[PDB]
Design a protein around this nucleic acid. Structure first.
Ligand SMILES: [Mg+2]
Ligand SMILES: [Zn+2]
Length: 466
DNA sequence: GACGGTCGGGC
DNA sequence: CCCA
DNA sequence: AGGAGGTGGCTGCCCCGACCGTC
RNA sequence: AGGGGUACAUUCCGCUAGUACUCCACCCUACGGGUUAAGCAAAUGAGAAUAUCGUUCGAACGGUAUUCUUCCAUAGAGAGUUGAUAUCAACUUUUUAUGAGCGGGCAGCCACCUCCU
């Protein structure tokens, strides 16, 4: 790929590209981040057509079709999306739930040990993935581990439900299958399913849908349960998680979203992520700049300050009583979680804005691993933290999910020569950190980020990947 | 004697 | 080669 | 070195028939 | 004045805003002050409980693990407690009303990576 330039008129894209100096009209964000806009002086009329949403992800389509292969029930393909229903178990119910978490972890560990003990290696240390997968069958492992499973169940007076422990065995088998799939695909050279300890910090117990009856789950032992919403309409297997850091019992119920009809505007977009502007949106009838890093610093100034000071305290002041060390670790996790929550909320709100404004998003594929790698020092370690906490890849995940949830096709594009390539004439110029992109051939005076976003849009409407 | 709840396995 |  | 956290990647998001408890 | 933390009917997970409480420098004089001082180890606290052990005298002190509490606001009424003259001021509690808008798909595992020191 010697050039990623396709003349705009080939793509029916107006050559409009704003000057780097503009007057930006702010967009209300209801969030910490700042969103700006610059309406094109000359705009084509906005189209519109009827769409049925949510759109089911292709991977979810495959998953549900395969789940229908075992003829569980001939149910229509649906768009699943979790939901956080908080529980308020009592002291007794809290103790029972903790014991059930312990038994779930113990069965998970036993299943992992069973698989490893029966894991078969192909001649050499290489794992014969097919045979190990067959060993990872939930039915076979459940039958084989009946004695150990029964002993585990018959060891606590509020004995866990057999069907929950079977869910634990299935989860262990699925995780081993995940690692095996990674192995065969060479995504990991070796793996080791670490046992679940008492300090896992995030304990999960999977509850079958059938157990959700009479406004509770497992009524035989939990006759009554407090929850944010009624538990009378759950129809899919649920996972109950306890977060020691947050001390919150939460049900991640995968709920069904009924498909309805909406009006979507034909507005192809392009996004060039990075630093100094988290997302520079360019659209044929509009240009937007999202979350400049100055406000990012201002919001994260406190969190980074506290994180650094806690780390320095831990290191430079050793031989601290574990109580103090544990408190410092708790605070560190709290401030990291605050940063993560800020970033997640910005991601979700920005995705909402973009999908509701555009029906097709061509976002750049910023390989954060390559950028963060210590191999290149072109970005200092101080900024590498900001790029890391910005969590661009998680943003891409959430944006893709939102686009599915609102019928917006979030295409992924690799930004290669986007910054260098001229959007108008196609001259390839290296500039470095310069904000202003001024082509010497065609004379375009365009902001660099906006030009990169336009290039991303152009390649997205006709990528060369095939 | 007839409705729910969990258990046993199904692939 | 994207980040500056 | 000892703690964060990320980045990608993959797998899930069950069910019908017996058998038993209660009326 | 500026900054941090905690809580907030408003289903829950959060973000923003706001509100309320609390905390952030030196000299002490060192339980009351000034500095004009913006304080940046400000919950990274504080307190209670469970233990398992070592020491001092069953208690305390220490670790090593856990856990649990750290307050919704304003306005109007009811009740209770305290001070002052059945009435006024302060505190606890029941109750009526009002109390911003924006999103929300996650769980688990793995390998690798960055960061702070
Ligand atoms: Mg770019
Ligand atoms: Zn040019």
């Amino acid at each position: 790929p010697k050039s990623i330039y396709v003349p705009n008129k080939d793509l029916k894209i107006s050559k409009w590209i704003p000057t780097p100096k503009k007057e930006f009209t702010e967009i209300e964000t209801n969030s910490w981040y700042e969103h700006r806009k610059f309406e094109n002086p000359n705009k084509s009329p906005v189209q519109t057509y009827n769409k049925i949403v949510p759109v089911v992800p292709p991977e979810s389509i495959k998953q549900q079709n395969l789940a229908n292969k075992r003829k569980k029930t001939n149910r229509p393909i649906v768009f699943i999306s979790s939901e956080k229903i908080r529980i308020y178990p009592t002291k007794d119910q809290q103790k029972i739930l903790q014991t059930w978490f312990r038994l779930f972890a113990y069965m998970y560990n036993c299943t992992i040990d069973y698989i490893n003990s029966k894991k078969v290696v192909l001649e050499s240390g290489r794992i014969n993935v097919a045979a190990t997968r067959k060993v990872c069958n939930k039915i076979s492992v459940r039958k084989a581990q009946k004695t150990i499973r029964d002993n585990l169940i018959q060891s606590t007076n509020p004995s866990i439900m057999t069907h929950i422990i079977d869910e634990a065995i299935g989860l262990a088998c699925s995780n081993y299958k995940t690692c095996l799939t990674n192995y065969i695909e060479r995504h990991i050279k070796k793996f080791d399913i670490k046992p679940w300890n008492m300090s896992k910090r995030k304990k999960i117990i999977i509850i079958e849908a059938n157990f959700f009856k009479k406004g509770t789950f497992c009524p035989t032992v939990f006759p009554k349960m407090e929850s944010s919403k009624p538990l009378t309409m759950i129809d899919k297997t649920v996972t109950l998680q306890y977060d020691s850091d947050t001390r919150k019992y939460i049900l991640f119920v995968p709920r069904v979203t009924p498909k309805y009809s909406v009006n979507k505007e034909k507005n192809s977009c392009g996004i060039d992520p990075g630093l100094r502007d988290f997302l520079t949106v360019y659209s044929e009838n509009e240009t937007q700049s999202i979350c400049p890093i100055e406000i990012v610093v201002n919001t994260t100034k406190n969190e980074y300050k506290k994180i650094d000071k806690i780390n320095e305290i831990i290191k430079t002041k050793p031989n601290l009583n574990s109580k103090r060390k544990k408190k410092l670790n708790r605070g560190l996790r709290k401030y990291h979680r605050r940063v993560t929550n800020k970033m997640k909320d910005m991601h979700y709100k920005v995705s909402h804005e973009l999908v509701n404004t555009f029906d097709k998003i061509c976002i750049g594929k910023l390989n954060v691993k390559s950028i963060l790698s210590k191999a290149n020092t072109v970005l200092k370690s101080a900024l590498k933290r900001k790029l890391a906490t910005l969590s661009f890849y998680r943003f891409t995940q959430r944006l893709t999910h939102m686009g599915y949830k609102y019928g917006t096709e979030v295409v992924n594009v690799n930004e290669y020569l986007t910054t260098k390539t001229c959007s108008n004439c196609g001259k390839i110029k290296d500039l470095g950190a310069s904000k202003i992109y001024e082509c010497e051939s065609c004379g375009m005076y365009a902001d660099r980020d906006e030009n990169a976003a336009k290039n991303i849009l152009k390649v997205g409407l006709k990528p060369w990947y095939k």
